[PDB]
Symmetry: C2
Subunit: 133 residues, 2 copies
């Protein structure tokens, strides 16, 4: 079948199984895909979304080890635009309003978040070996 | 060139960039490889080595997302034996004495550990936003 270009973006701070499962989902939306992953800048993430432990370089270097990732745009734009989709020949944006135009264009594909598998979740599990009393 | 079967093992608890860089190194020891990764059992890890946050299932499920990993043995034996190498047709063991026979057999390849990129290291970085005083 025709090769389909998928775009997913995010912070990917302290990359965990939840991120990887969502990237896998994006990658497998069609039989033959190219998965482009956008990694948000440190200053725009901190300004608009919240705290980030790892630098852009660190978050991008880690993502390059994930087998579902074909291409990385680092840093990606904070807001996705139609021109950005045209430039990279993106067929669908995979993500979990502001995204209204994406859906009007037929270029929206939903992916799911997995609960309970984040890196901070693991640290919470470590902490529970220490009873309050 | 001939395809070379590489075997690496470990706990792979809270998989981080240091693990992935070592798996990449193992995978790229020769131009054409099959990288088999062994994941140690919960009870043997806890008995012989130390504490483990994530279960065998969790550690194995995460490792399957790493592009360098071709095959996973889960659980792997705690001690690697010549018979184990014969069974899986392993040409080299990549790791960073007990391993004396591996080197006598020509089946030892050294890989390096990367400092300062572990998951706990990241948590330590979070904690430093909170001054002692």
């Amino acid at each position: 079948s025709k090769n389909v270009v998928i775009y997913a973006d995010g912070v990917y701070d302290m990359l965990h199984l939840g991120h990887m499962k969502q990237l896998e989902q994006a990658k497998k939306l069609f039989e033959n895909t190219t998965l482009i992953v956008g990694v948000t800048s440190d200053n725009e993430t901190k300004l608009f979304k919240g705290q980030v432990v790892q630098t852009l370089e660190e978050r991008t270097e880690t993502l390059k080890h994930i087998r579902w990732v074909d291409e990385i745009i680092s840093p990606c734009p904070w807001v996705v635009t139609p021109e950005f989709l045209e430039k990279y020949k993106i067929d669908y944006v995979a993500h979990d309003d502001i995204y209204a135009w994406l859906k009007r264009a037929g270029k929206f594909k939903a992916t799911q978040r997995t609960e309970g598998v984040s890196t901070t979740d693991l640290i919470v599990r470590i902490l529970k070996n220490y009873e309050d009393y």
